[PDB]
Amino acid sequence: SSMSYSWTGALITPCGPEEEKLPINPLSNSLLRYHNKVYCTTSKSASQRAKKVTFDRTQVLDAHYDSVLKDIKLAASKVSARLLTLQQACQLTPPHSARSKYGFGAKEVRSLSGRAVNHIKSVWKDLLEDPQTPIPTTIMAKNEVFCVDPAKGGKKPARLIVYPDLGVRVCEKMALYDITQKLPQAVMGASYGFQYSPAQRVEYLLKAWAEKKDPMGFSYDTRHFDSTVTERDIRTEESIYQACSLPEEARTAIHSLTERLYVGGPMFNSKGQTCGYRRCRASGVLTTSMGNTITCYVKALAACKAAGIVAPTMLVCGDDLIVISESQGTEEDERNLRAFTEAMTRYSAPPGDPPRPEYDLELITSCSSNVSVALGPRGRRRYYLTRDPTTPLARAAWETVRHSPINSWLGNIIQYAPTIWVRMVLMTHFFSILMVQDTLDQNLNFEMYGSVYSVNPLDLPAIIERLHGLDAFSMHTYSHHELTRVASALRKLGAPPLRVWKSRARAVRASLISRGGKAAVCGRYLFNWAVKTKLKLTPLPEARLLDLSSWFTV
Numbered sequence: 001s002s003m004s005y006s007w008t009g010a011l012i013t014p015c016g017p018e019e020e021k022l023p024i025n026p027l028s029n030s031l032l033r034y035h036n037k038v039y040c041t042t043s044k045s046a047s048q049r050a051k052k053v054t055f056d057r058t059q060v061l062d063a064h065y066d067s068v069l070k071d072i073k074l075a076a077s078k079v080s081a082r083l084l085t086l087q088q089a090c091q092l093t094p095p096h097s098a099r100s101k102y103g104f105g106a107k108e109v110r111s112l113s114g115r116a117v118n119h120i121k122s123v124w125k126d127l128l129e130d131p132q133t134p135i136p137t138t139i140m141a142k143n144e145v146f147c148v149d150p151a152k153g154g155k156k157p158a159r160l161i162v163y164p165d166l167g168v169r170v171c172e173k174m175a176l177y178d179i180t181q182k183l184p185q186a187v188m189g190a191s192y193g194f195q196y197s198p199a200q201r202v203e204y205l206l207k208a209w210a211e212k213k214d215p216m217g218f219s220y221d222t223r224h225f226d227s228t229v230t231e232r233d234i235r236t237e238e239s240i241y242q243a244c245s246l247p248e249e250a251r252t253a254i255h256s257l258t259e260r261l262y263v264g265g266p267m268f269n270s271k272g273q274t275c276g277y278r279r280c281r282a283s284g285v286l287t288t289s290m291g292n293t294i295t296c297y298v299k300a301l302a303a304c305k306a307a308g309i310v311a312p313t314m315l316v317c318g319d320d321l322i323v324i325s326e327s328q329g330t331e332e333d334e335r336n337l338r339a340f341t342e343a344m345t346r347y348s349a350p351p352g353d354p355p356r357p358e359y360d361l362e363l364i365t366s367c368s369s370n371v372s373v374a375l376g377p378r379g380r381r382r383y384y385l386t387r388d389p390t391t392p393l394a395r396a397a398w399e400t401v402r403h404s405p406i407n408s409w410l411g412n413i414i415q416y417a418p419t420i421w422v423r424m425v426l427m428t429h430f431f432s433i434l435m436v437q438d439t440l441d442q443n444l445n446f447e448m449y450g451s452v453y454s455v456n457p458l459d460l461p462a463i464i465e466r467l468h469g470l471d472a473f474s475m476h477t478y479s480h481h482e483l484t485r486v487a488s489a490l491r492k493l494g495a496p497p498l499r500v501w502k503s504r505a506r507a508v509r510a511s512l513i514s515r516g517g518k519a520a521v522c523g524r525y526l527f528n529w530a531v532k533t534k535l536k537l538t539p540l541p542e543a544r545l546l547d548l549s550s551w552f553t554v
């Protein structure tokens with residue numbers, strides 16, 4: 001049937017300067033040694049990516065699909081959603097969103113400047129009047145940092161970004177922002193993955209697992225999900241949006257964005273040239289995350305029914321998927337998974353790595369992460385979210401004229417506070433750098449889900465207690481999988497081993513303690529693992545006064 005993309009042969013071009021690595025990385029050369037291994041994806045590998053994501057989709061739906069889609073339209077119709085005013089939408093534009101081609105940027109949009117509001121008025125009108133003309137998009141190579149992996153081809157090619165002009169993106173919010181806030185939760189309930197902090201994610205998986213008399217879990221990895229979304233999936237999404245109680249102007253707007261933007265359209269590189277034509281999900285539109293999540297949910301749940309998965313409990317986050325269910329014995333489990341995969345493939349969501357049933361929660365990875373377990377000093381089991389530290393370490397070491405890695409350090413310290421690698425490596429490095437710089441009391445930005453929060457480093461103990469519990473400060477005996485993986489990642493990036501971090505941590509803790517006040521709290525709480533004679537840590541009152549609820553909800 002349809003190709004995800006077609007190409008004119010024009011290059012996917014850079015937006016000006018692509019940053020050289022410098023001969024000295026002064027913030028991270030005490031963190032790890034093998035900087036040669038840390039790299040950033042650029043436009044140079046853009047074609048390589050285009051080839052991998054360009055392919056034919058043929059899609060065969062069935063009674064299981066239809067049945068699930070009907071249930072979802074039902075659940076959708078429970079939702080009442082509003083238009084946002086032009087001004088409300090303008091206001092929700094992130095401060096660094098890519099400037100429009102019509103002579104204004106995010107600053108103007110957020111400030112409600114007359115010219116911007118005007119242009120946006122005329123874009124909205126054109127959306128109500130013309131429900132057909134394809135809206136042009138820009139295509140860019142994404143810049144992301146990884147550690148080289150010889151096993152998997154050396155260097156990954158850059159992901160591709162496809163987005164309409166800023167004027168249109170503002171219109172998308174007026175039409176759909178409210179739906180993005182209400183639909184996923186309404187169709188999926190507790191299965192919606194973007195509503196959970198790490199600790200809450202953990203607790204959900206544990207509850208799912210404990211409800212099965214004989215649990216089995218698997219993760220599902222779709223190969224290039226965006227590319228696998230069909231015009232029909234997209235029209236099916238519009239049709240789910242339309243099932244909500246909306247005002248007529250929204251209906252018209254949604255239809256128009258579906259036919260003119262979401263379903264497909266022509267792509268131009270940054271130099272102005274026609275680059276190709278897209279017939280799949282665009283990565284840079286408002287509905288990408290909700291879209292992928294709902295469509296993955298519909299497909300996955302129908303696939304469960306097609307394969308005979310018993311009592312599924314799902315967790316969905318865009319293209320990432322965990323299913324925990326009642327085991328039917330290993331031999332049937334393996335067959336059901338093969339059938340699940342066949343259904344998904346029929347639905348046009350074929351796998352990368354084929355799925356595999358597992359019976360131990362530590363062995364399931366989704367969203368690049370997994371649950372693991374550690375003991376208190378008394379033998380009590382504590383479960384927490386973790387992940388391979390390779391990419392966090394690589395990103396911890398990306399330093400250029402334009403980018404500092406410190407925010408990145410902070411983000412992982414926050415998300416992954418209870419892990420052995422955060423506690424022994426990142427925390428130790430982070431606090432040592434800030435002390436020496438004498439910037440311990442200076443606010444930094446925590447980046448999550450396109451949002452930013454100003455965080456004071458001396459507030460970390462409170463934040464961590466709030467997010468993860470006082471247990472985050474007393475994990476004693478980590479797992480074999482966890483010890484192995486962390487040792488191996490440190491060795492792979494040329495970082496000191498954990499034994500050296502313990503020494504560095506002792507010294508950092510001492511320096512924090514000697515500075516008194518908040519810093520001293522940091523040293524006592526965050527580095528209690530580093531001393532043989534433990535202090536008794538107690539709930540922090542400043543933590544009770546904390547509302548982090550918006551941090552991990554979309």
Ligand SMILES: [Cl-]
Binds near residue numbers: 402403404405
């Ligand atoms: Cl930066």
